[PDB]
Structure formats: structure tokens, C-alpha cells
């Protein structure tokens, strides 16, 4: 019945938007279960964190079947 | 889940530490694990942390 | 130290070691200083005759921090590898 109780608001979402230069370890998307999928040179960590495996710029392409949003890094 | 100790079958005194549900799996654990003091994989077989 | 009432840093982090009583009488004298003693010898009492090292020091190591200048003799005094090289290069010698 009685009612308080929130939690500490985990700061999720898109870091490193769609034209930005990335280094080879940077967190792309903090994610709660794959909104965005792992593209060309990006990694998919344990808690579905997208991180960069190479350098370049972020792409954010909507590719393929299943309508999936991909974060990929184009070496440019 | 009371915690146990898994000591190395090799001659060292190296131990990995974990839990176990005693009232469902009471027999001891003989899992092959990596010992750093000899630097090979050996069986670990122990309980009784005290 | 007081942080308003939370646990301050000097009570929240652990204590980490001991001080050696072995090293209260320890000393180091670098190679820039060995030309400053008189008498073409670097001894413990000779390093105390100049003010290069305190009284109540007993162990001196010589390390390499410059140029030795002269050809001095180091009795009873340890030296590092590069410092023994640079002392014996410019005419020095070494006994005990």
C-alpha cells in the first residue's frame, strides 16, 4: 500500500552520436538489452554495452531484416 | 549457500573460494582449475574453510 | 579531516605498512658529492667531516647522479652498478 521507493537512474542512452570520431575502446551506447545492435567494428559487452573495437566515426545504420538499428564504425 | 574453499591438489597452499548448497549437493567438488603457484590446471578438492 | 560527519578519508581507507627501523641510520650520497670530501678517500667518518651526511648514519650507498670529479677511494661504502662504473672509470678504486 504505502509508496516511496525509486532507484538510482542508471544514466543510460547514446553516448557518441552519429558522426563522431571514436577511439578503440570508447563506450558507444549504454543499453538495457540491445536497442542498438553491434555493427562493423563495435563490440557488445556483458550488459549489452556497445563499445568500439577500432577507430573511425559512428554510423548508426538501420540495416537488414528484423528492422534492427546498428551502430557501426566506419574507418574514415 | 554457505561458502566453501577449493584447495589445489598440487603441493601448494593455493585456494579458490566459492559457495555451495549443502542440502542439495552434499558431495564434494572435484573441478579442474588453474593453480597460479605451479602454473598448470589441476583438480581442486576441498571444503571446511576453518 | 572533518567532512561534515561521513567517514573521512583518514578513517575510511586502510593502514598500509610499517616503517623500517633498519633505515633510520641509512644514507645515500650521490656521485656529485664525492669530490667534496678531503683527502682522496670517501669513508663514513670522512663523509661526516664534510656535512655530506648526518651523524648517526652508518650505511651509505653511492648512486649515480652526476660526475665524480676526482679519483677517490671508497672504503666500507656500497655503490650501485652505474655508480661503481663511474667511480672506477674516472680513476677511483674500491676496498673494504
Amino acid at each position: 500500500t504505502r509508496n516511496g521507493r525509486d532507484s538510482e537512474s542508471k544514466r543510460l542512452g547514446v553516448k557518441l552520436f552519429g558522426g563522431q570520431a571514436v577511439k578503440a575502446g570508447n563506450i558507444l551506447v549504454r543499453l538495457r538489452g540491445t536497442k542498438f545492435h553491434a555493427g562493423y567494428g563495435v563490440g557488445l559487452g556483458k550488459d549489452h554495452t556497445l563499445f568500439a573495437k577500432v577507430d573511425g566515426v559512428v554510423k548508426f545504420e538501420t540495416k537488414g531484416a528484423f528492422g534492427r538499428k546498428y551502430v557501426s564504425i566506419v574507418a574514415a | 549457500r554457505e561458502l566453501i574453499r577449493l584447495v589445489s591438489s598440487a603441493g601448494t597452499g593455493h585456494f579458490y573460494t566459492t559457495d555451495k548448497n549443502k542440502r542439495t549437493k552434499p558431495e564434494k567438488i572435484e573441478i579442474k582449475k588453474y593453480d597460479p603457484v605451479v602454473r598448470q590446471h589441476v583438480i581442486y578438492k576441498e571444503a571446511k574453510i576453518k | 579531516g572533518f567532512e561534515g560527519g561521513q567517514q573521512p578519508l583518514h578513517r575510511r581507507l586502510p593502514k598500509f605498512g610499517f616503517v623500517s627501523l633498519k633505515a633510520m641510520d641509512r644514507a645515500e650520497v650521490r656521485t656529485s658529492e664525492l669530490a667534496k670530501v678531503e683527502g682522496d678517500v670517501v669513508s663514513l667518518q670522512t663523509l661526516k667531516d664534510a656535512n655530506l651526511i648526518n651523524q648517526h648514519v652508518q650505511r651509505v650507498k653511492v648512486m649515480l647522479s652526476g660526475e665524480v670529479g676526482r679519483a677517490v677511494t671508497l672504503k666500507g661504502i656500497a655503490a650501485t652498478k652505474g655508480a661503481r662504473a663511474a667511480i672506477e672509470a674516472a680513476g677511483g678504486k674500491f676496498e673494504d
Binding site: - | 573460494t17 | 567532512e3 583518514h10 581507507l13 598500509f16
Partner: protein, 63 residues
């Protein structure tokens, strides 16, 4: 000597030429819950960052 360093601060913060060293919390007495990756990364002796320096070396009587 007419300034007393806090003795609990001297046991916690050894001074080097790189700053003031300290050890980490959480590596005591609850070490099965933690992964090895957490116990590996609290093991060393870290530096003391900017927000803490003025307070610690005011406690360690150096300001």
C-alpha cells in the same frame, strides 16, 4: 615541532614524489561476492586525487 600530524592520517597516506599514496577500500572480509576483476583492481596502491589533497595534507600537517 609545534604542529601535530594526525596519526591516523600518517598510517593511511604515505607521501612520495608522485603525490600521496593510499590503498583501496573493500578488500577486507567479504571476498567471495566480489569477482576476481574487482579484487584485482583494488590490490595496488593508488594516488590521491585533487579534491582530496588539500584536506589530507591539511590533516597531515603540510598546508
Amino acid at each position: 615541532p609545534k604542529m601535530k600530524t594526525k596519526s591516523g592520517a600518517a598510517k593511511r597516506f604515505k607521501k612520495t614524489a608522485g603525490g600521496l599514496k593510499h590503498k583501496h577500500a573493500f578488500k577486507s572480509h567479504i571476498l567471495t561476492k566480489m569477482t576476481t576483476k574487482r579484487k584485482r583492481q583494488l590490490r595496488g596502491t593508488s594516488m590521491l586525487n585533487k579534491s582530496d589533497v588539500a584536506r589530507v595534507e591539511r590533516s597531515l600537517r603540510l598546508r
